[PDB]
Amino acid sequence: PPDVLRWVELAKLYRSIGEYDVLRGIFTSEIGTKQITQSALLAEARSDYSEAAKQYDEALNKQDWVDGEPTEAEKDFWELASLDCYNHLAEWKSLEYCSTASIDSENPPDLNKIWSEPFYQETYLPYMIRSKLKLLLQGEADQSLLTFIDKAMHGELQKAILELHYSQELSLLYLLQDDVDRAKYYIQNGIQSFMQNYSSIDVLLHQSRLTKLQSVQALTEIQEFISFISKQGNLSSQVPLKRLLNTWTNRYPDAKMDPMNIWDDIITNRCFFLSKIEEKLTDISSLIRSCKFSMKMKMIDSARKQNNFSLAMKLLKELHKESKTRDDWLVSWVQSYCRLSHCRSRSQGCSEQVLTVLKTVSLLDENNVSSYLSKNILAFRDQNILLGTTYRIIANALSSEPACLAEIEEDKARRILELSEKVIAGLYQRAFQHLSEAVQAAAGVIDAYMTLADFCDQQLRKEEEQAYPALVVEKMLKALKLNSNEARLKFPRLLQIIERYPEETLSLMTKEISSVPCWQFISWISHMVALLDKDQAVAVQHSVEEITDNYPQAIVYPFIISSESYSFKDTSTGHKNKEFVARIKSKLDQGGVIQDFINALDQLSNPELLFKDWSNDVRAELAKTPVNKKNIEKMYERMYAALGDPKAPGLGAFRRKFIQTFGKEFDKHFGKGGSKLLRMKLSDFNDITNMLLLKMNKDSKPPGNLKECSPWMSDFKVEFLRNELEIPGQYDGRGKPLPEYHVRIAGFDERVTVMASLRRPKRIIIRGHDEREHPFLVKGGEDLRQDQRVEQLFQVMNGILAQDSACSQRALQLRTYSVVPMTSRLGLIEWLENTVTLKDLLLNTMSQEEKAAYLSDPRAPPCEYKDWLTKMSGKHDVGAYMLMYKGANRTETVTSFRKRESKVPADLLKRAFVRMSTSPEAFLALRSHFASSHALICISHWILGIGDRHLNNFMVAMETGGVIGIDFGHAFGSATQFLPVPELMPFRLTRQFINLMLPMKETGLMYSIMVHALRAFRSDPGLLTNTMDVFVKEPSFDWKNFEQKMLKKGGSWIQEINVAEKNWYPRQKICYAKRKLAGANPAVITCDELLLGHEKAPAFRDYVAVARGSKDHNIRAQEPESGLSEETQVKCLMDQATDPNILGRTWEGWEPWM
């Protein structure tokens, strides 16, 4: 065919530049039509290279296949994938016969036949010479190679390939036959081969250069063996031997970043080199064998981490025979096997998870009980840790699934219940004894503390429905006294166990928090200085005191906003708490420069919108019932401080260029304010305010035009040490902070830039003590604590995301812009250099006329959409959705959706990537980064369920093509609850993000990124679970700041609910996130969230019908409700994202089409 071998050659190209995902993107959509294809690629996409060839040898001998026939395009592909997925693991012996046994049989004369028919010359040859060399290097004779080598070394057309390419295999072969000089010439041609090959690759095609560069360690290891074997200065004694052995075992390839064949190359070459150098010149060899065993053991402990499991298992069964002389080898062998069983069992079913770790008991009542768990107490500790965690695994296995697990294999049921609920408590007790041995038995004890920590916290969150709270606190804090990233983020668990159990061991917390390094709390300080108002601000006083003594700069900005509200206790215990805030308030802010800093930054914003904020605040507050006492006269003082007379800027502030245009004009209307606004108590007629507010926007002058609107910062002139300012937004954990070295703010440029948004924030260009120019964006008027919280969330998120293998090898990270809330209604936020928002990219890409007909046209897809809302429902604004859901079928909406999206241009994102790249060597590495980053943030915006991802919340950076996420108002699962017209799509993957990657399918890259990300997420010990728990279990938005920040933005949402406002309940959002992280179908969660906030809504059954599926077209209904897997979860996601039953009826400003 003329349209299939093209895909064969495209796969042939993409196999060479790494890129092993868009390789598999076409082997499920062009070379297909079967089912063994998908059933093997699902076990090849995850690193499970055993079953994904065990169902290719169980498919090459197929007979019937009566549904048609596999063409000639995939019968070769099946054996080629069999070769590849035999090569990635240690199957060399079953590679040679399966390579050369496809031209003839009867042990064929493979001499010149492979030098014929060039399909027999690129594919079957390198695996043959590779496999035969790997099988020769183990040590045998087998004499199958040099005859073919010497026959092919005869003639130019049989030598100008076998000398061009390979030469390192040949260098090792001629080292095996002991002519070192031709081996010298060959390895030197190998070094020149790497140089000339490296020089011709382009400079931005990354990961191809890595696949080149990862071999020079093997090349130089051969070069060093040659340089070492020939010299006669090393034949005298054993010390250059000893030094070379130490500098070998010192160096290593790293774990978590090198694929397994490079580990194989270096390990086997080093073992053969070492055996040769002991074979020639002749305890010594016992020490040599000990270095051999330790190098092999490090190879196994690196190969465990990447889920490359079957290679690890056959390596373990390789490495048993040597492990009998020295007992530490046996104890390392058994802990390595128990840890391999542990890392395996985190993915099996509940039926086999008990079996797969019950089988590893009989080697633990084995020897090493003979006096070696007495010589080392540390090995006793590690044995205790692994056994207790194994008992915890078995007890946690069949406590999740009821009692049905002791139904099969009754000898094993007798085995487990030998050591029905009275065995669960016994196994938990047998776990707890072995863990309590550890905390009484560098940093080989932090693991022993931390296992008790997470075990006991799991037991108490089981006990939500035993003096463990006495045990957990000091056994956590005695290791937090040491450095630990896994204990820095586990502190608010102590802050909540002491609050909920104050009569349970309050003094223990005090007696341990007495001596602790007081700079390990600097990240958590808003969870301590917002605790001064309540009780239990008595166990934590001196740590706050020490921070305000030694580092009195890094507590200041969260002390202010928590001093903004503090009502103290009438009992005399409160009479030292108000004394405590008095003492710290006196001894801090002694410079008196922080307050003028904040005040001049307040005088920079636009107060014209602050009056709108004040009008909406009072018309929401006093419009219920006039029984609120004194609060109107308590909150008019805030308005009268900043606004009113032109001398209150003098006294509380500096003279503003805006107040000489605002307060000076407002006397003939603010006399009315001083008459009736100071004594209103009416709340019946704010039309008088609305008409003046309509006039105040016509003649105002928002061009502030300079820095002179804030005169304090323009003329800064630092003089000497008056306890200088120390720029906001440093001191984010991470070791002992050097105080003197942050950028002392020393100047403000007289250039300000407003931004065009709904609130119109301003951007300033502040200058450096290191003589840089740090820009920032002031954010006047809004609460910005939640954005600090979710940047902490993204920090722990892509701190998880870089310690597995399969995301570190592909370099997936989020991009965290920084944010800081100086005081309430005043935040600084980091600005990024030369970025463009997504709708601006997709909008300026077009020409003149297509943009003109998209914006200004009657049948244009916005205006056509509101016209379809009219002609479907009858009414002509919001309020027609409720009659639109029930009163419309499927087939009108789907076809009308296609009919409206056909009018826009098609190749918009591809013209945007081609209008600036100027090189098709750059188009590839500018497209792949866009797709990789957009896929990662579209799955990480969903675990903690965020909505509202419209066209101005993605920003692209036009030097690499990444995308970022900003502006999170609907943080947890709350987009669909409290909005009127809900949103049901888990992210945004619309038509343009599809027409970019054509002609590839949307299962090549945007699927493998999401799968690797989600499987990287849900195997953690619950760091995300605890942090998400703590973020909503700290009340700062208890529907009040939520509704305030909701009405801050101007959309269509005014509250009046009275049923969902009682249904806030942060024991529900953690439950739903723990479900959709623990495994749940993503149509169950969306209809559950729509049920809990839209009960008794009219078209509610329509909502659950559209979210429910169709069972004939949408896969998201044909799947179960629980116990799924990652690929099924993400297949439901990618169906629900693009399913025009859903995208047809959504919010018009969300822009579903473009």
XYZ file of N, CA, C and O in Angstrom, residues 488-489 492 523-524 527 786-798 816 819 1024 1027 1030:
96
model
N 9.972 17.818 57.872
C 9.637 19.235 57.863
C 8.182 19.456 57.472
O 7.528 20.367 57.990
N 7.648 18.625 56.594
C 6.279 18.775 56.146
C 5.301 17.958 56.967
O 4.138 17.854 56.579
N 2.306 19.946 61.103
C 0.933 20.256 61.520
C 0.133 19.050 61.966
O -0.916 19.234 62.593
N 9.179 27.924 57.300
C 8.131 27.711 56.320
C 6.761 27.665 56.977
O 5.781 28.119 56.379
N 6.668 27.155 58.204
C 5.373 26.900 58.821
C 4.836 28.067 59.626
O 3.862 27.881 60.358
N 1.243 29.007 60.356
C 0.535 28.060 61.200
C 0.989 28.140 62.647
O 0.729 27.217 63.421
N -4.102 32.014 49.923
C -4.346 30.730 49.284
C -3.365 30.467 48.158
O -2.996 29.314 47.924
N -2.917 31.512 47.466
C -1.937 31.293 46.418
C -0.578 30.940 46.992
O 0.132 30.123 46.403
N -0.228 31.485 48.158
C 0.954 31.007 48.874
C 0.799 29.545 49.273
O 1.751 28.754 49.169
N -0.418 29.156 49.663
C -0.663 27.770 50.042
C -0.508 26.822 48.866
O 0.141 25.779 48.987
N -1.066 27.170 47.710
C -0.943 26.250 46.587
C 0.425 26.306 45.934
O 0.801 25.346 45.265
N 1.198 27.380 46.104
C 2.583 27.272 45.664
C 3.361 26.340 46.572
O 4.235 25.608 46.091
N 3.035 26.313 47.867
C 3.595 25.271 48.722
C 3.143 23.887 48.262
O 3.922 22.920 48.294
N 1.901 23.795 47.784
C 1.380 22.530 47.275
C 2.144 22.071 46.046
O 2.520 20.902 45.940
N 2.386 22.982 45.107
C 3.107 22.609 43.898
C 4.555 22.275 44.208
O 5.149 21.435 43.523
N 5.123 22.899 45.250
C 6.469 22.538 45.679
C 6.525 21.113 46.191
O 7.439 20.363 45.832
N 5.552 20.701 47.004
C 5.619 19.313 47.448
C 5.234 18.370 46.316
O 5.745 17.242 46.252
N 4.447 18.854 45.350
C 4.028 18.029 44.224
C 5.205 17.677 43.324
O 5.502 16.497 43.095
N 5.933 18.678 42.840
C 7.101 18.347 42.043
C 8.351 18.162 42.889
O 9.458 18.150 42.350
N 6.726 27.161 39.198
C 6.127 27.919 40.294
C 6.682 29.334 40.310
O 7.754 29.588 40.858
N 4.786 34.125 45.108
C 3.758 35.040 45.590
C 4.015 35.345 47.065
O 4.549 34.512 47.803
N 0.850 14.227 49.997
C -0.198 15.041 49.417
C -1.480 14.951 50.227
O -2.160 15.964 50.394
N -0.984 17.148 53.451
C -0.889 18.573 53.161
C -2.216 19.123 52.669
O -2.622 20.224 53.068
N -4.318 19.569 55.804
C -3.951 20.710 56.633
C -4.353 22.022 55.973
O -4.761 22.967 56.660
